[PDB]
Amino acid sequence: SRFADAVLDQYIGSIHSLCKDQHGCRFLQKQLDILGSKAADAIFEETKDYTVELMTDSFGNYLIQKLLEEVTTEQRIVLTKISSPHFVEISLNPHGTRALQKLIECIKTDEEAQIVVDSLRPYTVQLSKDLNGNHVIQKCLQRLKPENFQFIFDAISDSCIDIATHRHGCCVLQRCLDHGTTEQCDNLCDKLLALVDKLTLDPFGNYVVQYIITKEAEKNKYDYTHKIVHLLKPRAIELSIHKFGSNVIEKILKTAIVSEPMILEILNNGGETGIQSLLNDSYGNYVLQTALDISHKQNDYLYKRLSEIVAPLLVGPIRNTPHGKRIIGMLHL
Template identity: 30%
Template sequence: MDGHLLNCIKVALEVIDLDKKTRLVQELDGHVMKCVRDQNGNHVIQKCIECIPTDRIGFIISAFRGQVATLSTHPYGCRVIQRVLEHCSNKLQSKCIIDEILDAAYDLSQDQYGNYVTQHVLERGKPHERSYIISKLTGKIVQMSQHKYASNVVEKCLEYGDGAEREHLVEEIIGQSDENDSLLTMMKDQFANYVVQKVLEVSNDRQRELLLDRVRVHLNALKKYTYGKHIAARFEQLLGEGLEKLSFTET
């Protein structure tokens, strides 16, 4: 697609009045999906969603029906879907988009681009939408935490879930017995170690103490691993200086 022409359209959408914007974007009817997948065209679609009321660009939102999961795994499509989540004011259309994301949440969480869409819903979605995603991942948290992309989603679940959901996720990570090896596996993993650090930030006092007790047993083993060394040093600092003085920001 002509990048110069599309850039002109994008600029025009910022300066012309609403009626002219509406007439201009009608020219895109029938070409929405092609634009979304284009490196220049996707920016125009995003600008349409940002600058024009939903009731005037219904044909754009409608074009995504049945394609939301596929678009969410596309490098440009995932950006467009996030703009829809931010700006779509039509409750019915918005629900249709969200429902498709929720249905595919498990797979999207593991996708290079789809994980950002899932995180977006966890950060900005309604409580029942967050709960649905968390329920989809519950029982698979240890496995997902060791995944490059899904681990970021697990961190968002821990951060944005309600108290009961967070407690359930933490229990799954910590395990129910001292012989449980999942925690050690996570602490020495290049991705899951960050999830364990997030657990320390969000867990209640009882769970935090339980986690620290489990880590003490594994400290020497952790020091043998590249990523385990990271977390061992942080836990030792935590144990020595107290929780309030420790930052888990990676250096």
């Protein structure tokens, strides 16, 4: 290309003009990778005034990302100060969000972290809810100290329902449970638990309810799992035939320490009517199949108990349908 046999020094005073091109950018990124200090200085001096515009640029963003790694702490702090008032603009941009995630990954000082929290805090929900913005917010949780990412938990505490039930907010909620302090995660789960009814039936909320259990199961320490089960068990059948509620029922059926109480509810307060409802539902069928699969593995008394209610129902029509044939497969094992 144009820059194969070119040299940083010939571009001094014209570096910004290269930051348009994909090839100019890659040239510069090369120079940053190999010089590098002198490259970082030259490039920092000629692009600092335009960081926002290079951050939200399709090729320029990758340059700033590279620049951020290679630049000194003094320089990095300047790039942060210049861009910080425009974090919303940058976070909404498909590229801006990638450049700004790198910035966060790169910060070493606590002054740098205070500038970032100060700059993001006012906009936490908006960004949590944004297709590009939510990632900047998650990076904060992945990278900062809990004391610095508190603001995210605080903002969520106040818009919990809409953030939990949001396509992207739900991913940010899950990042909170990944990195949150026990105290943080507890205060958050308390709020979520007050909303477990709504969340369970929700397209996106049901995943948050599952994730709590996922996380607790990871640690082998159970708290909110038990509190959730306690609230939803009384509706085991009702939720088993729900597009989204059934995701949670299955999640519980697949969590060894709570499997059997749930299977029991299905057996007792469901009976042949409830079970026939499952066998015959677009959703509860799979839940029914989960029930048989788990019970066969964990508890012969429950499996045989389920089997003897199910098998009388598997006759005629159902037997030849795909869903009928599915349960038939779970029957004698």
